[PDB]
Symmetry: C3
Subunit: 110 residues, 3 copies
């Protein structure tokens, strides 16, 4: 799911933009169990493309979503960035980078 | 979720047009736990706007929806009308008045 | 859900192509409780038209769906074929005939 190079990066990323706690292995195990509960293939966490497919599957549920659902989305958003060689310090940067790249793909449409 | 003025009208609203059973607090407690079960923030039941968002989230599931889902939609549909200060006698009136606004 | 003539057909269909295990009553019980769990009316399993609506509702979840979700879709696809009196030997033939029927 994460390589050794990906995991040492993962473990430095902060949960909040200026908090002390950082992402850990148990958050990946947690996200993997959450997807099973939602009848989603947890093996999709293994690639950039799988994470991209999951975030698109979950996005329509974000606005009305519980804290559990939003935490799950945020975790997979950070995971997507790690797979993608996108350096992020915190969850918010991961979320910022997904919108500005999803904004770029709109720009690429025309 | 409901103020005292809103809770006062809620308890007079009939489940069926126009049967004996009326909405109570236990219907709100139930709907809130059902939303948690479907990973929906039950805190959206506190406002008119939150209820509209849930109703739009649930709308596409209605045609194939279980009895549990249709009851849940009906309960928050009545809850939306109370928040909007729309007087309704029964669930079916709540469903129509929500439909006439969605048309506009 | 199934008549006796349909149940005689159901119990001959193999889970996997030329495998040994065959569909049984418990797979219908499972699919029905699995649908309630996802807020889908299990009463739609009783007709060809109901199964097609369920399949259409489940379709967008297939690409990211777990093995549990695909297993549910596959069981209802076979049930559709039995209702529609389409002869299938196994789950894959059911899936192929539903795809080729939507192509026409």
């Amino acid at each position: 799911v994460l390589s050794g190079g990906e995991l040492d990066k993962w473990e430095k990323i902060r949960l909040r933009p200026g908090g002390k706690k950082q992402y850990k292995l148990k958050h990946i195990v947690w996200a993997s169990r959450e997807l099973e509960r939602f009848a989603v293939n947890p093996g999709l966490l293994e690639t950039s493309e799988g994470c991209r497919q999951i975030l698109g599957r979950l996005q329509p549920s974000l606005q009305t979503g519980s804290e559990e659902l939003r935490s799950l989305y945020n975790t997979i958003a950070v995971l997507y960035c790690v797979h993608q060689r996108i350096d992020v310090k915190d969850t918010k940067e991961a979320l910022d980078k997904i919108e500005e790249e999803q904004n770029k793909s709109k720009k690429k449409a025309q």
